[PDB]
Design a protein around this ligand. Sequence first.
Ligand code: MG
Ligand code: MG
Ligand code: MG
Ligand code: MG
Ligand code: MG
Ligand code: MG
Ligand code: MG
Ligand code: MG
Ligand code: MG
Ligand code: MG
Ligand code: MG
Ligand code: MG
Lengths: 177, 48, 195, 110, 205, 215
Amino acid sequence: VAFRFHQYQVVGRALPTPGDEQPKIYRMKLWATNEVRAKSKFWYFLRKLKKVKKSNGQMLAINEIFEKNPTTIKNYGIWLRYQSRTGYHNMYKEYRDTTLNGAVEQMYTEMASRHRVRSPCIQIIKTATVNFKLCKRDNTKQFHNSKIKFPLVYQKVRPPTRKLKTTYKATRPNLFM
Amino acid sequence: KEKINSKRTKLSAEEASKIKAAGKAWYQTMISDSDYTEFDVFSKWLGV
Amino acid sequence: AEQYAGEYEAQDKELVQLKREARMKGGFYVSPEAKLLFVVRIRGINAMHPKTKKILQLLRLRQIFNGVFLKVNKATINMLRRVEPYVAYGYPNLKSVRELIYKRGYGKLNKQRIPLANNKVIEEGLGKHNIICIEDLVHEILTVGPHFKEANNFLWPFKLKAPLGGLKKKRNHYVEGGDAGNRENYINQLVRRMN
Amino acid sequence: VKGRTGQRVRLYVRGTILGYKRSKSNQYETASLVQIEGVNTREDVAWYGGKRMAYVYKAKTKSNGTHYRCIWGKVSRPHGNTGVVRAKFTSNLPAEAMGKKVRVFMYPSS
Amino acid sequence: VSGSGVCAKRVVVDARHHMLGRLASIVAKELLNGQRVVVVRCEEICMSGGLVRQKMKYLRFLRKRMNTKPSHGPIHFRAPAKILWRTIRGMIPHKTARGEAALARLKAYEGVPPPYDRTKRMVIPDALKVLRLQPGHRYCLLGQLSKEVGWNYADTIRELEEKRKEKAKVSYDRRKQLAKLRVKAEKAAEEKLGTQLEILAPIKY
Amino acid sequence: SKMALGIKRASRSHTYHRRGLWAIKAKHGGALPKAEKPAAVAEPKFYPADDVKPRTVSTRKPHPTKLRSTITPGTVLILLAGRYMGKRVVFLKQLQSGLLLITGPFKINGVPIRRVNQAYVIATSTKVDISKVNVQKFDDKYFAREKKTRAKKTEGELFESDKEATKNLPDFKKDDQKVIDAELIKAIDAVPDLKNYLGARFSLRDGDKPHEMTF
RNA sequence: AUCAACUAGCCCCGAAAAUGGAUGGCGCUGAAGCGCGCGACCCACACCCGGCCAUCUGGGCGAGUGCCAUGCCCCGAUGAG
RNA sequence: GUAAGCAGAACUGGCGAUGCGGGAUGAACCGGAAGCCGGGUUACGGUGCCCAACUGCGCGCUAACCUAGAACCCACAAAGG
RNA sequence: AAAUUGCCGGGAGGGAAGCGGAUGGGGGCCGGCGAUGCGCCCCGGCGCUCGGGGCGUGGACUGUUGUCGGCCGCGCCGGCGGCCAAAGCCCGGGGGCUCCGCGCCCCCGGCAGCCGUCGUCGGCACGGCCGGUACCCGCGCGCCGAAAGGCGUGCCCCUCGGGGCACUGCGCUGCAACGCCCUGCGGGCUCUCCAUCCGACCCGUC
Ligand SMILES: [Mg+2]
Ligand SMILES: [Mg+2]
Ligand SMILES: [Mg+2]
Ligand SMILES: [Mg+2]
Ligand SMILES: [Mg+2]
Ligand SMILES: [Mg+2]
Ligand SMILES: [Mg+2]
Ligand SMILES: [Mg+2]
Ligand SMILES: [Mg+2]
Ligand SMILES: [Mg+2]
Ligand SMILES: [Mg+2]
Ligand SMILES: [Mg+2]
């Protein structure tokens, strides 16, 4: 269903000028929540990297990329640049998820939790699939095993829909894992 | 409703092939990634 | 109305045709930017900078939740850049324009506001400008026409409902999460809730 | 319970009168708030929306042969996510009316 | 929390192992709604945060006394029933007629004094320790807290609950026997009725 | 198809057909007739001071109420208000005023053939086969009251005297109920257990949620 | 399998005032804390529709069946002091 | 001026003259400016009880044996461990 | 006359009372507080009114339901298009990986089941508030039909189903059904007292 991020690719170039009548072309792969935010981030990176502003630039194409096999789990790596309270740093993060799109969500959530870093402070330098037997993080590496088995230490007791739930119940619930 | 010729032959196999090839070419260039043979300091961190 | 529907349909299909044609030829087609903006004011009339007050008196946004149709030209878009924290604007599509002009269409006739509940009122306000019907008016706005100045100064600044389903924060730009500024297409997804 | 006296059919689904439509600092006594026994969802009150209720109380003096009075109203629309409803009455309820029970029939039924 | 809306004359709560503040908010809203509640075995209410933390909270509470007239100041209660009644009063608006009428509907007891033995004692799922405290985090029983802030009836509740538990166990054994003979009756009537009872085959368990 | 019906009705040509201006081009030759000047009474008995306005013989011809989808002739209703609440009845036919016409039958339920508003009934999913009940005799005039004059204030000598005497419901209605309940028990014994069913009344005992409860 | 440094999140030490005592209170610990989200939802005399009052603007009403013409009727907007 | 809820200026807005919703409480902080009513929807802010709205769906970190911590102004904490 | 006091009757009171907005319960009070008349029609006298009778109707307040409008809210469903569409499913092919999470991963080509994201067209069921007609609608001028409604001619269209258009005229033009009460222990009150909820600092003034 709905994904809070979408990996667009934005293609843009400076406006035509009398010399250099075909200005050179730049492509980028940006995460955002929708088109207009992806575009606004694209001009950010071509105004702090390639010295081109939206006024003196022009956007030619924006595509929304999707994922190949949503049904399979893919060990993802993200190399990311972030701002702490007193400087900048560089992180590497390994996730297991069915899509890069979900991995990015999981990664913003992890940076907002482990470091109180918000979205406006985070950059995704490079994203890739770091397939198994080459993963680096222990929490990724420990799910690389068939014949895996673990019981559920944490299982909310909860009625299937809001209708079936009342305030008094005779019997103390039987919880067992 | 009773499986009449609902959308039938609309375009031929050579056209439906070149269209698919152009789409896949745009997909290759649309998910293409960077070389990273520029940043001689973060080579080992970036993996390349 | 027949040939307006025909040409709307032809333009919509034609864009797709050129985009596939450019893709198959190798490069890509770049859509020709929107000629028209729908701008709706999203801040109260209290504690405004006087420049902002004058800019909004010219954009005709003189009360919260008014929504006006604007040509895109450099003078206008750099006039929007000045009051951007106060407005939410974007590119309306055909359903947006038609159902606003029907469901909330009022005319500046003799400085009085007339509910365009019939084709007649167009005949007086306009018609010197070759607009006879509500569909002529909708077209000549949407495909920004030669007489769009007159066919827009005829209209009254649309009075909108408050946004059903709520709103996001009005303090930030849309890119930062809020509502102000371009939402380029999503003014479509918004007018359905302002209306 | 068995071999009992009282009413022999319940054609109404009981509920509590709950308060008024309040802000954090206002009351609008026009619209009361009502909880139905058994509704636990905002779309379960879809079926009650419109059905008519009666506040039944009894005064100090007989009138027309009874102490019982009854002020009539109906479930206008849902309120909140847990099946509380808003009730519109012919006259606004007493504030002693809140905490007591109100009868929600199924008359104007569909 | 808007209430269950249930129809009982009185609803009892076996308050053993429930979070004090959570049970307190649920019960406080029930009272304000107007449904008469009676909470028992209050001596068992588990409270998050260790016993030393709840101690220092209560001994800070002891300091608060009116300087010029201690007889007029914050009345520090010790028994768990009154600790609960005060925790619930802190959640009910008790300076109006509505709020005092609400508290008039609350009756809190240590143990289970009659006639609340021969009754079903309802537990509130939204407040149980097992469902609201992660296993392994500090908690203390309001019985131990009052036993250490100077409620001199921890013993006297204890003999009475030992007596009530043995008196309940004997009767539970009696009802086991009565239910196994009702089960042999269950099958004996089913075998005596054939097609008379087909309609209950698909909705029975 | 509410809006397709709107357009199909709204066509100018279809309005010509509907108003039937042909057969008005029939009677008066090959043209639409003239109209003339009525109201030549010229005999006003009294002249009001206020500007006079005549009685409204209402020319608006309202639509008929739509009988619910889940109502079929033969459907077992649930009465909900009035003295027969909970009573289960069988729906005979939705009569010309708009109100439903139901029957107990009076042999089992005590609910005679009586008129009930559609609002206060909940159709159950069960049906009966009653295409051999002869109901045409029932209409609005059968039930129209001709309520009598208010000069009769019920006094200590009227109270039980009307109970003790029989100047009440008439004997043709007595015989009526006999014919209908006969021809309708002959249809009820077909459906098993239904006589006992109708003999019961619906009670929403504890642990019953109408939004959940089907019918 | 591990050793050291650096870094930064929350927590801790650093952290002392006099009436009894204040995350607003009770309480809260797979939070009812902190950071990020998602569905709804609650809430202003704010926005929309509708009725009514008033102000303002703009119209209609004589070979008068003709009127507190200083009147009546219609349209539109507005309403802080 | 060491600073001040201090003294003096520049641009704008506010209070003064102004209600109303939120920030518990506040002239000027956030939302927003108003005839009197009915209906709908929102802004700021919230949904554990007081108190109208979720003990909602998710993911992490904190365990405070000091009053852990919990709202723009705002009712502080520092060097340093 | 008022402040102020006494008796008589009533009302209420857990460290103020008073005030504003809701109704609820008590009182005190209102018959212009709320109706019984209109036409036709037959005498019997006094065309016109009164006396009798037959006749269809008709009143304050209040309730319910119905049907049209208006605004609104909520729920469910179907089609279309865009996207390289992607995917699993069905088949075929193509690479490295070497004991590995190993019946391992990645990619490419065919096909004719359902399945995202935006856009859009449509169907319906439910409800809430207001209005109820001098024009917009609607009605008669023909028949059939208790009634929703149907019924003709000629052109254009596909050609089943069936659809589009057409010539247009006079006049008229305050939506309905049934209740409940009617000097009552009724109705409701802007008057009084009280209870509860929300609000609520003491006015003038520099
Ligand atoms: Mg809503
Ligand atoms: Mg908000
Ligand atoms: Mg106080
Ligand atoms: Mg004037
Ligand atoms: Mg409202
Ligand atoms: Mg609440
Ligand atoms: Mg005196
Ligand atoms: Mg006295
Ligand atoms: Mg008062
Ligand atoms: Mg009163
Ligand atoms: Mg309607
Ligand atoms: Mg002076």
